């Protein structure tokens, strides 16, 4: 019944369910990022040599470079029977507010964590921008999640790679003290009441612990049937608007502006609620957020369920045994080289009594003199000089160093190529596109395209605030994956060049060349060429 206890019970259920995968993934991250000697009590011992002879980091770097050389992004395409340019505005907004450094950085971090630990995640958020807003004085931006395995605790009853069937998710925010004051100021919290939340319990390298602040955001999705209002557009058509979005703000401003209500329907849709929680109390209860989907997008590597239990693996988890063995054998051999007596003669003291300056290593003498006679035993017994035998690396150590290095070499071969990892990144990118489209329909201003132009239909309230109005005819474009472009002009240039590479040297070749000149950037020479191409196209009709 209690909200805190219901949220906490869900959180601990998920946290316990994902206990094994999270710890294995955190071990992968620590192994491939901090140190290859995952020992916690070896810091308190007497010191032995512990070398680090890495053979998996080059493979990780190669995979990261390979998957960074091939960017991937969302690509909106018109549906079947929809207008041919139904994705123009949505694509324009996506390219506008996903070109920034934060979006590319978030994707890159998710990719690196997918390669190393096997799981990564990023987030989509909305903010109010007054200087350069994409639409409706707002922007949609993308943020990373560092250590997704331990910072994103998805709903345990999810059988989908992209977690679209998850009904809740808890995201753990970690921030310094000053970051905590800024967070409290921004979310209207009590900066003196210092918050807390569960973070993973470990043993390794206590120096990784920072005096920080943890809080949680519980996202929960609820699918319900809510009322929609069937109006008659004073310009043309019969648009549909939800009740909850204009319950009080412009409910009768619609009528004053000229919207005469026609019919009332109940339509099923999803809503997302965010709650800021600590261990002992709830700070923000059920803040409704934009969109129909949870704003967290996960990226997975080798993902599956073994026995009703999730498993996800990268490329590092499987070479740890061979690499640890190689480290150990190399350290043993280095100890052999350092701490061992060297090859020197074995002497009785009476053999060289009185001649010890000949054997100290100087080269002032032509030979070495040995004593011959013994006062009691008459003569010195004859036996060839022994030498301390030279240090050697055991055949076992050599054989196993070679074998362990070969084993890591075989294991650390992702695929044959990173096709499956790029395909999982593309799965996450289609989920990202879907989430972005939902948030856009919820907060932005979508101008409908008519064949009689863009008809931007909105109205203000008595509090000077403008409330967006979007018809239910909104999902006219579906999601795909294509190259990453910084703007629609670059996208048009790429499409023109792709067509030109295949069109032979007929009349369409001249046409596409003139178009390529038209869509070029501006200096002086390209301005002249663009004006000439404009004149040619206009005069050719």
């Amino acid at each position: 019944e209690n909200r805190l206890e219901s949220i906490l019970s869900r959180f601990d259920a998920d946290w316990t369910a994902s206990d094994e995968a999270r710890r294995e993934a955190k071990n992968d991250l620590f192994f491939s990022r901090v140190s290859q000697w995952d020992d916690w009590l070896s810091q308190y011992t007497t010191l032995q040599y512990r070398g680090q002879f890495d053979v998996v980091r080059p493979v990780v770097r190669k995979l990261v470079s390979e998957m960074r050389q091939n960017p991937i992004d969302v690509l909106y395409r018109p549906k079947d029977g929809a207008r041919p340019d139904a994705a123009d505005v949505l694509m324009g907004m996506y390219r506008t507010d996903m070109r920034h450094n934060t979006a590319k950085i978030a994707v890159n971090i998710a990719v690196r964590e997918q390669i190393e630990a096997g799981v990564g995640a990023w987030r989509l958020v909305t903010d109010y921008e007054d200087q350069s807003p994409t639409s409706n004085n707002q922007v949609i931006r993308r943020e990373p999640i560092h250590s997704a395995c331990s910072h994103v605790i998805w709903d345990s009853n999810s059988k989908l790679m992209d977690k679209s069937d998850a009904r809740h998710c808890t995201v753990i925010h970690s921030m310094s003290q000053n970051g905590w004051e800024d967070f409290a100021e921004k979310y209207d919290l009590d900066a003196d009441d210092i918050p807390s939340f569960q973070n993973p319990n470990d043993w390794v390298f206590p120096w990784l612990t920072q005096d920080t602040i943890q809080i949680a955001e519980f996202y929960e999705v609820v699918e319900k049937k809510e009322t929609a209002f069937i109006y008659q557009d004073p310009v043309t058509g019969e648009p549909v608007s939800y009740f909850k979005r204009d319950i009080k703000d412009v409910i009768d401003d619609l009528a004053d502006s000229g919207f005469i209500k026609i019919a009332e329907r109940q339509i099923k849709r999803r809503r997302v609620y965010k709650s800021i929680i600590t261990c002992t109390a709830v700070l923000k209860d059920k803040q409704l957020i934009a969109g129909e989907h949870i704003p967290i997008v996960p990226v997975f590597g080798e993902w599956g369920f073994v026995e009703d239990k999730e498993v996800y693996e990268g490329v590092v988890r499987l070479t740890k045994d061979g690499q640890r063995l190689r480290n150990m054998i190399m350290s043993f051999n280095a100890d052999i080289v350092a701490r061992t007596p060297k090859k020197k003669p074995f002497f009785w003291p009476e053999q060289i009594a009185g001649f010890e300056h000949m054997y100290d290593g100087n080269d002032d003498y032509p030979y070495y003199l040995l004593n011959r006679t013994d006062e009691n035993s008459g003569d010195l017994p004859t036996q060839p000089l022994a030498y301390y035998e030279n240090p050697e690396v055991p055949q076992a150590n050599a054989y196993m160093l070679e074998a362990a290095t070969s084993a890591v070499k075989e294991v650390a071969t992702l695929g044959v190529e990173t096709y499956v990892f790029q395909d999982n990144l593309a799965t996450a990118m289609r989920r990202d596109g879907e989430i972005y489209q939902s948030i856009v329909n919820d907060i932005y201003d979508v101008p409908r395209n008519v064949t009689i132009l863009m008809a931007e239909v909105v109205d203000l309230a008595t509090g000077e605030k403008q409330v967006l109005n979007d018809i239910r005819g909104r999902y006219e474009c579906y999601t795909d994956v294509g190259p990453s472009f910084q703007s629609m002009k670059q996208q048009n240039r790429a499409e023109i060049l792709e067509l030109l590479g295949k069109t032979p040297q007929g009349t369409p070749e001249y046409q596409l060349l003139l178009l390529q000149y038209f869509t070029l950037l501006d200096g002086k020479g390209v301005e002249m060429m663009r004006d000439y191409a404009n004149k040619q196209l206009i005069q050719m009709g």
């Binding site: 206990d19 916690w40 003196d192 009441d193 939340f197 206590p206 261990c279 109390a281």
Partner: protein, 421 residues
């Protein structure tokens, strides 16, 4: 020696009281200096006069307070040998059991404080299975005493039965020789009902305490003692220091056989109507908190007397008792036989202060300290690990720093069935 990883689950605990108890987290930076104490005011009560000409009869203002503090951490320090396979195998499940036992400790402390500082006492001379609807008589008696004392119940109310009396109430329901909704539910499931006799939450609690019979006989009050509602008093140095409103020290003839949590009542002393100051028909009941010395005790409701003449009018406006102590009146015990306690309270009567342990600081190098959410109850503790080679081991410690506080001991109650003999 074949062995498996399937664990035979053996115990399963439920902690409802710690769920119902509200949790308070004051600022640690200030609590470090305030000596882990924080004071809160008490709803003001005002005096009144009658007549036209009331010169020189103007009163002042007097606003009382209570103090909430905290005790000591509750830990699960244990040590992990790195070579023993039987230690390597059980470590994570030991952490799980640590969390469960810490939550159990919290709710046991809540129950013990609620039972041992509950002023309201509802006794019966016979068991709950004796007559028909006597479980409802218990719950309605609790409701009636709260209503008559005019205590605030805006946040809610709760009545916790022990399993014995819960089953007795269920038996009373199913012996009804009829089956509608209430008896049919009490038959198919054990649950009597969720609300009974005006309480909006009637639960069963597996760890309510058993209140031992007191050995006290023939104890009387030594000297008339008048207690005055004050908000602060001067100390030996002239500094004004605050006063808890929830305690009074009474000097008796002999405090032998009296222990913390015993329930007493003074003969002749009667309750009051709180706001309206109309006497009731029920003797005032008190709970001895501490037996200090061999002739003093500390009872948790302060007996402020309406008929007292040494009180300023604003102090008399806080009277919850009709008459004061009279140097001979007999203090008679109320728990005259061993019996497990049913406990009722208003939901705002008990709180749980909680504090952090900043062991993640840069002072504590070598240790790895993380946060550790206690499940069930809404509390946070620390989980600290430090390896060792003086014994080639490692030490794990799960610590939790909290404290239960009865802010309104007069809104808590104890139901004592079978108080005969």
């Amino acid at each position: 020696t074949l062995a498996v990883d399937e664990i035979i689950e053996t115990i399963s605990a439920i902690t409802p009281m710690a769920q119902k108890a509200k949790k308070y987290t004051p600022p640690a930076a200030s609590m470090q200096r305030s000596s882990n104490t924080i004071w809160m005011p008490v709803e003001q009560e005002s005096p009144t006069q009658e007549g036209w000409d009331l010169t020189d009869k103007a009163t002042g203002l007097l606003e009382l307070n209570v103090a909430v503090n905290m005790g000591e951490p509750d830990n699960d320090f244990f040590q992990l040998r790195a070579d023993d396979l039987r230690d390597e195998t059980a470590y994570r499940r030991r952490i799980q059991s640590a969390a469960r036992k810490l939550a159990n400790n919290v709710e046991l402390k809540v129950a013990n404080m609620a039972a041992e500082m509950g002023s309201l006492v509802i006794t019966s001379p016979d068991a709950i299975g004796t007559n028909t609807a006597d479980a409802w008589n218990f719950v309605a008696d609790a409701e009636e005493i709260m209503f008559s004392r005019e205590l605030n119940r805006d946040m809610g109310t709760s009545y916790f039965f022990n399993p014995q009396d819960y089953k007795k109430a269920g038996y009373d329901l199913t012996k009804r020789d009829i089956f509608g909704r209430i008896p049919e539910e009490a038959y198919r499931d054990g649950t009597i009902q969720r609300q009974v006799a005006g309480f909006d939450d009637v639960l069963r609690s597996p760890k309510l305490p058993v209140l031992t019979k007191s050995t006290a006989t023939g104890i009387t009050v030594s000297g008339a003692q008048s207690f005055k509602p004050v908000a602060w008093q001067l100390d030996n140095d002239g500094n004004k220091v605050n006063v808890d409103n929830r305690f009074a020290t009474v000097t008796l003839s002999a405090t032998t056989g009296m222990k913390r949590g015993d329930k007493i009542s003074f003969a002749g002393v009667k309750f009051l109507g709180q706001m309206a100051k109309n006497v009731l028909a029920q003797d005032a009941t008190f709970s001895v908190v501490r037996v200090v010395d061999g002739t003093h005790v500390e009872i948790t409701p302060k007996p402020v007397a309406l008929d007292d003449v040494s009180l300023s009018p604003e102090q008399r406006a806080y009277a919850n008792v009709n008459t004061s102590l009279a140097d001979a009146m007999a203090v008679n015990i109320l728990n005259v036989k061993d019996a497990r306690t049913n406990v009722f309270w208003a939901d705002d009567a008990i709180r749980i202060v909680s504090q952090p342990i900043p062991a993640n600081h840069e002072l504590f190098a070598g240790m790895k300290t993380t946060s550790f959410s206690i499940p069930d109850v809404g509390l946070n503790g620390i989980f600290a690990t430090q390896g060792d080679i003086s014994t080639l081991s490692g030490l794990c410690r799960i610590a939790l720093w909290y404290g239960v506080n009865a802010t309104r001991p007069e809104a808590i109650g104890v139901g004592l069935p079978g108080q005969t003999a």
